[PDB]
Design a protein around this ligand. Structure first.
Ligand SMILES: Nc1nc(Nc2ccc(S(N)(=O)=O)cc2)nn1C(=O)c1c(F)cccc1F
Ligand SMILES: O=C(O)c1cc(-c2cc(F)cc(Cl)c2)nc2ccccc12
Ligand SMILES: [Mg+2]
Length: 255
């Protein structure tokens, strides 16, 4: 408890968003390596998010799972707000997708497994993430996936939102299964299935569930993805079925 900036040595930048940056940092007392997201109050005000940020910080501080990024604590000063985060040494799934273009089936299935675990734990707490992008997935030091950033509700680009959300209607914990499908596709294909040059058209493509597989996408992967990317949230499987999908169990690296 009770942390101030004078308690940390700052290091190189690890990333930069529209509300301040993440830095590598060390805790002076214990020599703990961590990340330090710095957000600017002046800018958090002008967007009107001080409340949503508090609600998300509140939600994250109670979450412990090896595939969810810890929030250790937080504090603030005259102009800024600081989140103390688990440092993930192997960087973003985004950068690793740019490096390799596509992932194979073992890596995809393994990531999808770790994601579903993290989401199942999330739903047990009745928590929905509502936005899982490769930008927001980090790699721990054994390359294990870690969901970062947000945890929006209990109740930017459109590529990852399900149709109920973009149409306005109400949305179960089932929005997370659409996202799993979008990622499973993006991991194997190298781009998300509703990508498009403009927002308004990604909208149409999402709305009507208009995607096509390249030739290399195997049968088992076509099945999982297709059973996740259903317009009626009613029809998406439970994460139990995902984790026991034959394509997953055959390709997912063993526990
Ligand atoms: N908490 C956390 N750890 C990391 N680690 C990390 C390690 C290496 C690199 S790299 N290859 O040098 O660009 C990048 C990140 N990021 N991180 C963040 O919250 C974080 C994030 F979620 C998204 C984007 C940037 C971040 F900074
Ligand atoms: O009124 C303040 O002092 C102020 C505080 C905070 C804040 C403090 C926390 F301990 C945790 C979190 Cl998540 C946010 N956020 C702000 C955003 C805009 C403007 C002012 C603030
Ligand atoms: Mg206030």
């Amino acid at each position: 408890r009770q942390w101030a900036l004078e308690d940390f040595e700052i290091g190189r930048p690890l990333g930069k968003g529209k509300f301040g940056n993440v830095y590598l940092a060390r805790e002076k007392q214990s020599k703990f390596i961590l990340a330090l997201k710095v957000l600017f109050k002046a800018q958090l005000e002008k967007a009107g998010v001080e409340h949503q940020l508090r609600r998300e910080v509140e939600i994250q501080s109670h979450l412990r799972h090896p595939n969810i990024l810890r929030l250790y604590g937080y504090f603030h000063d005259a102009t800024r707000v600081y989140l103390i985060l688990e440092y993930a040494p192997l960087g973003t799934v985004y950068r690793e997708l740019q490096k390799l273009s596509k992932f194979d089936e073992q890596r995809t299935a393994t990531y999808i497994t770790e994601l579903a675990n993290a989401l199942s734990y999330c739903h047990s707490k009745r928590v929905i993430h509502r936005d899982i992008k490769p930008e927001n997935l980090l790699l721990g030091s054994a390359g294990e996936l870690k969901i970062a950033d947000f945890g929006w509700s209990v109740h930017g680009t459109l590529d990852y939102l399900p149709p109920e959300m973009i149409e306005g209607r109400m949305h179960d914990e089932k929005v997370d299964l659409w996202s799993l499908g979008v990622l499973c596709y993006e991991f194997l294909v190298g781009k998300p299935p509703f990508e498009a040059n403009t927002y308004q058209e990604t909208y149409k493509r999402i709305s009507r569930v208009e995607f096509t597989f390249p030739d290399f996408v195997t049968e088992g992967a076509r099945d999982l993805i297709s059973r996740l990317l259903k317009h009626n949230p009613s029809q998406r499987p439970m994460l139990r079925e995902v984790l026991e999908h034959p394509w997953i169990t055959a390709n997912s690296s063993k526990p």
